[PDB]
C-alpha cells in the first residue's frame, strides 16, 4: 500500500456514499490526529481505536443529514467532498500567506505543520504553514 492517508480518506468517501454507520482504517498516530480534526469540526461523529484480528484499527463513525422528500430520500452528506492535496507523487507545501480558503470559508484544509495537524483557520491563527494534507467539505 502506497498512501495510507489517501487510503483512509477513500475508505471514508466510499462508505459515506453507501451510507455506512462506520468503517475501519488501519491505525496510525498520524491518521488519528487527522480524525481528531475531522470530528472536532463535525465531519464525523468521531472514532475509537478498535481491534480486528489482533490488528489495530480506527473505527470511524459516519454522520449524514435528514431523510429527504422526493424519489431519492438519501440524505445529504456531511463530508460531501474529501481529497488528497499533497501526495507521495508530489509533495505540496504552502507558507502561511498562501494557505487556501476552502469553499469560501465553509470547508476546511487540514495541514501538517511543525505545530501539529491544523486547519487553515487554525494555521493562520498560530501563523505557520506546512504540507497541505487535504481538503474537506
Amino acid at each position: 500500500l502506497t498512501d495510507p492517508i489517501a487510503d483512509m480518506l477513500t475508505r471514508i468517501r466510499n462508505a459515506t456514499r453507501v451510507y455506512k454507520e462506520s468503517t475501519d482504517v488501519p491505525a496510525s498516530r498520524f491518521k488519528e490526529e487527522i480524525l481528531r480534526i475531522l470530528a472536532r469540526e463535525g465531519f464525523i461523529k468521531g472514532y475509537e481505536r478498535v481491534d480486528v484480528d489482533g490488528k489495530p484499527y480506527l473505527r470511524v463513525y459516519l454522520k449524514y443529514g435528514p431523510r429527504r422528500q422526493g424519489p431519492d430520500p438519501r440524505p445529504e452528506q456531511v463530508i460531501h467532498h474529501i481529497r488528497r492535496i499533497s501526495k507521495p507523487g508530489r509533495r505540496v507545501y504552502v507558507g502561511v500567506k498562501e494557505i487556501p480558503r476552502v469553499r469560501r470559508g465553509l470547508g476546511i484544509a487540514i495541514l501538517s505543520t511543525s505545530k501539529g495537524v491544523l486547519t487553515d483557520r487554525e494555521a493562520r491563527k498560530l501563523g505557520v504553514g506546512g504540507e497541505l494534507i487535504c481538503e474537506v467539505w
Binding site: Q69, G70, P71, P73, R74
Partner: protein, 231 residues
C-alpha cells in the same frame, strides 16, 4: 391496538431472493428462509400507526394498493370499511402522476351510472345498449375503489412495494408519503412508514391491514368489532 402473537400469523418469509437493504429488519435465516425479527416489526407498527392515527383525526385520505392475488380481495374488504379509495385490480399508470386525466375517466363512470339509471333513451340502437354496458362493467372492474379519490391522497398504503414500485414511485414524485407492509423481497429506504412482515400470507395481510382500518375508524368517529376474514 397492536397484538404480539403475529408470530401466530406471519413472521415473514423468502429465501436468498432478498434485497440486502432489508438487512436491518432481520433476525436469522432458517428454513432456507429469511426470518424477520418481530421485536423490530414492533418498534415500527407503533411509529407507522402514530402516523396513521394523526391522519384519520385530521380526516386525511389514504390510498390502498395491493393486487397480488393474496392481498387482492382483503383490500376491497378492509378499505371499504374506512370508505377510503383503493385499487384492487390493475394499477393503471399515472393514477397519481396524471390524476386529473385518469379521473376524467371516472366522470365517464358516473355518466354511465346515470345513463343506465333509466331512461335517457332505450331507443338507442340495441347493440349500443349492449356496448355501453360492457364499458360500464369494465370501468367498474378497475375503478370501483378508485372513484372515492377526488384529490391526491395525503398518504398511501401499499401491500407489496416491490410489486407496486410503480405506485411507490408515483407517490414519491408527488411527495405523497408511503406506508407499506413489506417482506425481504423489498427495498426499505423506499418506504416512509414501514411494516416489515410477510406480504404473501393471507393471514398476515389480514392482521396488518385490519388493525390499520380498526385504528382508522377508532380515531375517526366510532369503534367497530369484527370484520370479514377468509378462514
Amino acid at each position: 391496538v397492536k397484538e404480539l402473537l403475529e408470530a401466530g400469523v406471519h413472521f415473514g418469509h423468502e429465501r436468498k431472493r432478498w434485497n440486502p437493504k432489508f438487512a436491518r429488519y432481520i433476525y436469522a435465516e432458517r428454513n432456507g428462509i429469511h426470518i424477520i425479527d418481530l421485536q423490530k416489526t414492533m418498534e415500527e407498527l407503533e411509529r407507522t400507526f402514530r402516523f396513521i392515527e394523526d391522519l384519520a383525526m385530521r380526516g386525511g385520505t389514504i390510498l390502498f394498493v395491493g393486487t397480488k392475488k393474496q392481498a387482492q380481495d382483503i383490500v376491497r374488504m378492509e378499505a371499504e370499511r374506512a370508505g377510503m379509495p383503493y385499487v384492487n385490480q390493475r394499477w393503471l399508470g399515472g393514477m397519481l402522476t396524471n390524476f386529473k386525466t385518469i379521473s376524467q375517466r371516472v366522470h365517464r363512470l358516473e355518466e354511465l351510472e346515470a345513463l343506465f339509471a333509466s331512461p335517457e333513451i332505450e331507443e338507442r340502437p340495441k347493440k349500443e345498449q349492449v356496448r355501453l354496458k360492457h364499458e360500464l362493467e369494465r370501468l367498474q372492474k378497475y375503478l370501483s375503489g378508485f372513484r372515492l379519490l377526488k384529490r391526491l391522497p395525503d398518504a398511501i398504503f401499499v401491500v407489496d412495494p416491490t410489486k407496486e414500485a410503480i405506485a411507490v414511485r408515483e407517490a414519491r414524485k408527488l411527495f405523497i408519503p408511503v406506508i407499506a407492509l413489506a417482506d425481504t423481497d423489498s427495498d426499505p429506504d423506499l418506504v416512509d412508514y414501514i411494516i416489515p412482515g410477510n406480504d404473501d400470507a393471507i393471514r398476515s395481510i389480514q392482521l396488518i391491514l385490519s388493525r390499520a382500518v380498526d385504528l382508522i375508524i377508532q380515531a375517526r368517529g366510532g369503534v367497530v368489532e369484527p370484520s370479514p376474514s377468509y378462514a
